[model samples]
Target: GDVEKGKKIFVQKCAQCHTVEKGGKHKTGPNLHGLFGRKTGQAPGFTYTDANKNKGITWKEETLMEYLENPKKYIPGTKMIFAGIKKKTEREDLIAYLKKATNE
Candidate 1:
C-alpha cells in the first residue's frame, strides 16, 4: 500500500522532471537512477546551484529525509521546488519506496 502510494506521487511529481531509471534524460531535472548514497550535485552534465555544489552532501536515508522534509530549508539555495512531505510516517514510507525503487 505504501509503495503504491509513493509510486503514484513520484510518477506524478518527480517523473515530470527526473528519471527513475537509467537512460532517463528529462529536460528539467537530472536522472535519479541511483540517488541513494550519491553525493549531492554530483551528476554529470547537470548544473547545480552553488549552495548544493559546495555542501558536498551524501544522500543517505537521514539526509534524504531531511532534504525531502523541506528542500528550501535544508539546502537554502537548492533549486528543487518541493515543500516536502508533511508527515513523518509518509516521508519515511516514501523514502523506503524511493530506496527500493532506485536500488540505493
Candidate 2:
C-alpha cells in the first residue's frame, strides 16, 4: 500500500524532475537511479550548486526521510525548489517508492 501510494506521489510530485530508470537522462533534476548509496548532488551529467555538491553526505532511507521533510532546510542553497512533503506518511511512502523504483 505504501509503495503504491508512493508511486502516485512520485508521479505527481517527483516525476517532473527525476527518473528512476538506470540510464534515465537528467530532466529538470538528475535521474535517481540507485539514489540511496549515492552522494548528494553527484548524479552523473547533472550540474549541482556548490552547496549540494559540497554537502558531503550520502543518501539513505533515514537521511532521505529527513531531507524530504524540507529540502531547502536539509541542504541550503541547493537547487531543489520543492516546498517539501509535510505529511510524514506521504514522505515515508514516497521514500518507499524511491527505494523500490530506484532498485536500491
Candidate 3:
C-alpha cells in the first residue's frame, strides 16, 4: 500500500524541491532526504524560521502529516512555499512515500 500509489504522488508534488538523498543540500527549502524522526528546523546548513525552531518539532508520522497539511500552519515562518497538500488522502500517501523514500 505504501509503495503502490504513494510513490506517484510524491514524484509529482514533492520531487520539485526536495531530494530523498541523505546529506543533500537545501534548495528552495531544506532537503528532505532523511526527515522522519528528525528535528524540525534542524537540517544542517539550512536556515530556519522561528516558527519551526520554536515549535521543537520531531518529524514523526503525526507531525509530518500536520506539516504536509499546511506548512504555514505548522511552522508559521518557514521558508517553504508548499501550502500543504490539502487533501487528506494525498497527504497520507505523500507521508507514506516519505516513510519509504527517506530514512528515519
Candidate 4:
C-alpha cells in the first residue's frame, strides 16, 4: 500500500518532469537512474540551475528527504519548481518508492 501510494504521488507530482528509468530520456527534469549516490545537478545532459550545480550535494535518503520536503529552503534558487510534498507519510512513501525504483 505504501509503495503504491508513493507511485501514485510520483505519477501525479513527478512523472511529468523526471524519468526513473535507466536509459530514459531527460524530460523537464533528469532521468533519476542511480540517484542515491549521484551528486546534485550531475545528470548527464540536463542543465541545472547555478545553485544546484554548485551546491555539491550527494543524494542519500536523509538529504533527499530534506530536499523533497522543501526544495526552496533546501537549496535556495534551485531550478526544481515543485512546492514539495506537505505530508510526512506521503513524503516517506515517495522516498521509499524512489529508493527502490531509482536503484533498480
Looking at model 2, report the run of 10 residues with the lowest lDDT sum: 19-28
Across 27-77, the per-residue lDDT of candidate 2 in tens digits comes to 668877777787776777888788888887789887877788877768868
Residue pairs of candidate 4 with colliding backbone atoms? none
TM-score against truth, every candidate: 0.81, 0.86, 0.78, 0.85
Estimate every model's Cα lDDT from 0 to 1.
0.72, 0.76, 0.69, 0.76
Q: Per-residue alpha-carbon lDDT of model 1 for 5-58, expressed as tens digits?
A: 677676665676777776558467777767677888776678767878888867
Candidate 4, residue 2: Cα displacement in angstroms equals: 2.9
When 1 and 3 are scored with lDDT, the better candidate is 1
lDDT of 4: 0.76
Better of 2 and 3 by lDDT: 2
Per-residue lDDT of model 4, residues 1-104, tens digit only: 26666777776887878887754467678888777788886777888878888877688877877787787778878767887675567557887788878774
| Residue range 1-104, candidate 3, lDDT tens digits | 26667877775776666667644356655667777678776766777777677776578878777777777766766667775564677656777777887754
Worst 10 residues of 3 by lDDT: 21-30
Off by over 4 Å in 4: 22-24
Cα miss at 22, model 3 (Å)? 6.5
User: Which of 1 and 4 is the better model by lDDT?
Assistant: 4
Q: After superposition, how far is residue 39 of candidate 4 from its true place, in Å?
A: 1.3
Arranged by lDDT with the best first, the candidates are 2, 4, 1, 3
Return the lDDT, model 2, position 1: 24
